[PDB]
């Protein structure tokens, strides 16, 4: 039986919501015993990702990621790091600890390739500084980058609303204004906390916005992805 | 930093909801880095608990519990098995694998001691057959037992509604009728899926029912319990 390992806690609110998504998207038919097997390491003590870039302390963060990948390699068959910015550490991690890894950047890339329309990357300044989507996606030409000022506003939404567990729909107007400003109807969840927004839109039946949301995709396609 | 280990997946819907409860009850003040560190083994492939009792296959179930306690003993500082019925396996498990264990039966017992009023045990036939609450609680005299017929109705609620992720408030009328039938205003979540009901009551501000709910208690008192 295949086990998904989740290096989580970045942040904890979205980590818990992702685990919930896994079972919401894979309801069992007859017995509970059919349902996805998942190991979650929800460690919010993980250093601030953008903080680790803005200060000099990338080594500290990379070690955190490496030690926990060592654990999860022994326990799980596939691994996901529940944080986009955190993927910046991967070039420094030995290749053996990334054999089972499913990249959120690549999941986003595959989805955007099918959608094939310009889409607004909603992400932290850290994710933008490290150019994770621009350097990782075959569909980089379809990715619209936020300006520096709008990146800082996304930061506020992430830290003041989403990470603190407040209603994700409270930022919907700010998001719709951004989409209108950048002339698109789609966003990429370039920050995992936008899984929370994506769920809230789906719950309300708001189909006007296309969300390229890697965590929703992983949950939805668990059967096929997790081998 | 103290880590809670959760042997979960019994069932998965309540396991995910419990992890969510942990962060809902412990909102951070300044930084995310303050928040609870938790390892969840959500393995729904765990054999049916009552099924393992009704068939002859307790050994199979005990081994499942033992192998995963071996893992979590190395990783966590405190351990919780997210299933009341599953506690029946503990007498067969070596004493070294239970040093870090926090019993849901004991958490319920401590709470009932403070409340000090008769309370209806909502639990599976398996939990009743094994007499986990009657044999484990100092406050056993305050525990009202469901009749055999009403135990089977609780079974239906658990399997048809709660485990399948349907709205826990859909069984509220049946629960209120039971409380009235047994002449009390309190229940014990003798089955972990009643954490889902407890959350739903709290969300709606229904204060007329007292829920002795071990998972809510563990989430709420994480700081003090998890050492």
Q: Looking at the DSSP assignment, which residues form a beta bridge with residue A188?
A: A121, A212
For the beta sheet containing B78-81, the strands, ordered from the edge strand earlier in sequence to the opposite edge, are A78-81, A3-8, A37-42, B37-42, B3-8, B78-81
φ and ψ of B80, to 5 deg: -130, 135
Which tokens hold the place of B121?
A: 């045990």
Cβ-defined contact of B44 to A24 (cutoff 8 Å): no
Which tokens hold the place of A49?
A: 């990702």
For the beta sheet containing B186-189, the strands, ordered from the edge strand earlier in sequence to the opposite edge, are B143-145, B119-122, B186-189, B210-212
How far A44 CA sits from the closest chain B CA (Å)?
5
Residue among B13, B24, B38 whose CB faces A23 most closely: B13
Separation between Cα atoms, residue A145 and residue A123, nearest integer Å? 9
| Cα first-last separation, chain A | 9
Among positive and negative, which fits the CA dihedral A80, A82, A83, A89? negative
List residues in chain B touching A: CB distance below 8 A. Answer: 1, 3, 9-13, 15-17, 19-20, 22-24, 27-28, 31-48, 71, 75, 163-165
Integer-rounded Cα radius of gyration of chain B: 17
In this structure, how many other beta carbons lie within 10 angstroms of the beta carbon of residue B207? 8
Residue among A3, A17, A32 whose CB faces B12 most closely: A32
A148: annotated binding-site residue?
no
Measured between CA atoms, the residue of chain A closest to residue B12 is A23
Query: In this structure, are residues B125 and B152 in contact, taking their beta carbons and an 8 Å threshold?
Result: yes
Choose the mutation target among A42, A43, A51, A192 for the interface with B, i.e. most B CBs under 10 Å. A42
Which tokens hold the place of B112?
A: 């009932």
Query: In this structure, are residues A105 and A172 in contact, taking their beta carbons and an 8 Å threshold?
Result: no
Among all chains, which residue has been given the structure tokens 């398996």? B126
In this structure, how many other beta carbons lie within 10 angstroms of the beta carbon of residue A206? 13
Query: In which region does residue A205 sit, left (phi positive, over 0), alpha (psi from -120 to 50) or beta (all else)?
Result: left
List residues in chain A touching B: CB distance below 8 A. Answer: 1, 3, 9-13, 15-17, 19-20, 22-24, 27-28, 31-48, 71, 75, 163-165
Characterize the bridge pairing of strands A37-42 and B37-42: antiparallel
Separation between Cα atoms, residue A116 and residue A217, nearest integer Å? 16
State how far the alpha carbon of B157 is from the alpha carbons of A30, B44, B53, B160, B213, in Å: 15, 19, 20, 5, 17
Query: In this structure, are residues B215 and B195 in contact, taking their beta carbons and an 8 Å threshold?
Result: yes
User: CB-hemisphere CA count at 13 Å for A13?
Assistant: 28
Cβ-defined contact of B32 to A20 (cutoff 8 Å): no
Strand ranges in B115-206 using DSSP code E only, listed in sequence order? 119-122, 143-145, 186-189
Q: What is the resolution of this structure in A?
A: 2.3
Per the document, the length of chain B is 227
- Contacts across the A-B interface (CB distance below 8 Å): 111
Cβ-defined contact of B42 to A19 (cutoff 8 Å): yes
Among all chains, which residue has been given the structure tokens 């003041």? A160
How far B179 CA sits from the closest chain A CA (Å)?
28
Residue among B19, B46, B165 whose CB faces A40 most closely: B19
φ and ψ of A186, to 5 deg: -135, 150
B181: annotated binding-site residue?
no
Characterize the bridge pairing of strands B3-8 and B78-81: parallel
A163: annotated binding-site residue?
yes
Taking contacts as CB-CB distances below 8 angstroms, the residues of chain B near A27 are 164-165
Taking contacts as CB-CB distances below 8 angstroms, the residues of chain B near A32 are 10-12, 44, 48, 163
Separation between Cα atoms, residue A164 and residue B123, nearest integer Å? 34
Q: Looking at the DSSP assignment, which residues form a beta bridge with residue A81?
A: A7
- DSSP three-state, residue A40: strand
Stretch (H or E) spanning A79? strand A78-81
Residue among A1, A10, A19 whose CB faces B19 most closely: A19
Among positive and negative, which fits the CA dihedral B13, B14, B20, B24? positive
Query: In this structure, are residues A76 and A4 in contact, taking their beta carbons and an 8 Å threshold?
Result: yes
A84: annotated binding-site residue?
yes
- DSSP three-state, residue B11: coil
Taking contacts as CB-CB distances below 8 angstroms, the residues of chain B near A44 are 28, 32-37
B119: annotated binding-site residue?
no
Cβ-defined contact of B23 to A12 (cutoff 8 Å): yes
Cβ-defined contact of B16 to A12 (cutoff 8 Å): no
Separation between Cα atoms, residue A28 and residue B160, nearest integer Å? 12
Separation between Cα atoms, residue A225 and residue A146, nearest integer Å? 30
Separation between Cα atoms, residue B84 and residue B191, nearest integer Å? 6
Residue among B9, B16, B45 whose CB faces A16 most closely: B16
Separation between Cα atoms, residue B10 and residue A173, nearest integer Å? 39
Measured between CA atoms, the residue of chain B closest to residue A163 is B32
Separation between Cα atoms, residue B85 and residue B184, nearest integer Å? 23
How far B10 CA sits from the closest chain A CA (Å)?
8
Query: In this structure, are residues A142 and A187 in contact, taking their beta carbons and an 8 Å threshold?
Result: no
Taking contacts as CB-CB distances below 8 angstroms, the residues of chain B near A124 are none
In this structure, how many other beta carbons lie within 10 angstroms of the beta carbon of residue B137? 20
Distant-in-sequence, close-in-space partners of A69: CB < 8 Å, separation ≥ 6: A7, A79, A93, A97, A98, A101
- DSSP three-state, residue A121: strand
């Amino acid at each position: 039986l295949p086990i998904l390992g989740v290096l989580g806690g970045m942040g904890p609110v979205v980590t818990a919501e992702f685990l919930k998504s896994i079972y919401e998207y894979n309801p069992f038919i007859d017995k509970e015993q059919e349902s996805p097997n998942v190991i979650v390491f929800s460690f919010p003590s993980a250093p601030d990702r953008t903080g680790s870039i803005d200060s000099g302390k990338e080594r500290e963060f990379i070690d955190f990621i490496q030690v926990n990948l060592e654990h999860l390699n022994k326990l799980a068959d596939c691994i996901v790091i529940g944080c986009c910015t955190a993927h910046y550490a991967l070039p420094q991690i030995p290749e053996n600890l990334k054999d089972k890894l499913i990249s959120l950047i690549k999941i986003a890339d595959q989805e955007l390739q099918e959608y094939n329309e310009p889409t607004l990357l909603l992400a932290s300044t850290g994710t933008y500084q490290k150019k994770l989507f621009q350097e990782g996606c075959t569909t980089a030409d379809l990715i619209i980058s936020l300006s520096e000022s709008d990146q800082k506003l996304i930061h506020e939404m992430i830290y003041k609303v989403l990470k603190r567990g407040h209603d994700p729909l409270s930022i919907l107007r700010d998001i719709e204004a951004l989409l209108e400003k950048y002339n698109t109807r789609s966003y990429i969840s370039g920050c995992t906390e936008f899984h929370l927004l994506t769920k809230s839109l789906k719950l309300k039946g708001i189909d006007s916005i296309k969300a390229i949301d890697p965590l929703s995709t992983i949950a939805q396609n668990f059967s096929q992805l997790i081998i």
